[PDB]
Amino acid sequence: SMIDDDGYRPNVGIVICNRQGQVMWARRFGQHSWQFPQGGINPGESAEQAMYRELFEEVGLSRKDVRILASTRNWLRYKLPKRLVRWDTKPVCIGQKQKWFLLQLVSGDAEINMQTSSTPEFDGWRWVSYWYPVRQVVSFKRDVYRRVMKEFASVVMSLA
């Protein structure tokens, strides 16, 4: 499996910005919590390959719909709340380890489509102001989000 020896699943997260410097904010399927797209790196893929695959699977965007503006250097880790760990599932996953990508959406909003897959992870999306996710993300991801959005800020605060 992909779970590392500390119990962290390798994962890639996606911050998609438009030309107004808003970021894409997506509603978890059948729930009322919102987040950025993210997903597991599969065996044999690089972080960037997993990113493009999850990107199309979750948001319906192709390579040519986006441009990579930045990515974080090293792994950023968050721990699952103890209550959500499945201790019976071997090897035990206690959290995820993430590389984050900043993408500019270069196509029109209509190219976004959340139902390319059999099992969609989102059922809605909207543009939100850049720092809004730092407040609204679920608590156990907030420290990762704060660091990600801080690192990406200079790049986004440059598209005017």
Partner: protein
């Protein structure tokens, strides 16, 4: 170590904190500690910049006093806030949309690094001041002690009574101020402005604030004086206002339009403190 800045706006010393990229919770105890000039940082007020609550706003910010309580006074800290978020690279926008304890605002940072605030449209209706008078007048007569005074009256959301003087340094702000501030014709009291008109585009001002006496930089008083002066045909559409605390610039196209107030914010220092 928590990063912070010191800034000066409207004659007040702000400690200003980026709580967007820093993870900090401001308990009343932490705030009172930080207010201590020897144990902490020392400040008139603490301005804390946070992520927005609304996806269509850019930021939220709070202001705390040295006692550790959140203060909710309209437009307070707005100029330092707007310059801080640009100076720290939290935004590159010139029109910044922000929520506060009093509602929401659109702040505009000008090319001279001044901050312009939409203060709304002045209301001269006596009933909205509130002011005791039958109908609105550009000038009113009021007896104050055994002296009679001419004045304009307006509400910027709060009540104002504006009196023309020939020199603000030689004004009886300390005797006439109290008498008019709680004058019986102001059932909710009023702020008493003493306006020396230098030019159609330039006034000096002292303000005896409702309940608070003379302060250094009453922003709503600057607005009220310039609104009265314009309503009276004495002032241009854009007026420099010199106050004890510094300079503001007011702009108003008269009834039908909002009035705008533009002011500086000085970035005094950066610092850090371990919490």
């Amino acid at each position: 170590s928590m990063q912070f800045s010191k800034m000066h706006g409207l004659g007040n010393d702000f400690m200003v904190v980026d709580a967007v990229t820093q993870n900090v919770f401001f308990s009343p105890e932490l705030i009172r500690r930080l207010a201590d000039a020897h144990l902490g940082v020392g400040f008139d007020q603490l301005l804390v910049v946070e992520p927005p609550y609304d996806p269509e706003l850019d930021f939220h910010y709070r202001i705390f006093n040295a006692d550790g309580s959140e203060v909710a006074q309209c437009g307070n800290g707005a100029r330092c806030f707007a310059r801080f978020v640009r100076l720290k690279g939290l935004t590159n926008k010139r029109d910044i949309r922000v929520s506060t304890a009093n509602g929401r605002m659109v702040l505009t940072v000008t090319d001279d690094d001044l901050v312009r605030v939409n203060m709304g449209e002045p209301n001269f209706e006596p009933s909205a001041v509130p002011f005791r008078a039958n109908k609105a007048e550009k000038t009113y007569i009021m007896r104050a002690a055994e002296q009679t005074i001419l004045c304009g009256v307006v509400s910027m959301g709060n009540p104002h009574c504006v009196i023309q003087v020939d020199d603000v340094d030689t004004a009886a702000v300390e005797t006439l101020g109290p008498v008019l501030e709680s004058h019986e014709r102001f059932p909710e009291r009023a702020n008493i402005g003493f306006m020396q008109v230098v030019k159609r585009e330039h006034i000096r001002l002292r303000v005896y604030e409702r309940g608070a006496g003379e302060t250094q930089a009453c922003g709503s008083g600057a607005c009220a004086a310039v609104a009265v002066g314009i309503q009276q045909g004495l002032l241009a559409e854009e007026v420099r206002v010199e106050l004890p605390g510094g300079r503001l610039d007011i702009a108003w196209k008269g009834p039908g339009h909002p009035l705008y107030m533009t002011g500086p914010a000085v970035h005094v220092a950066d610092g850090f403190i371990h919490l």
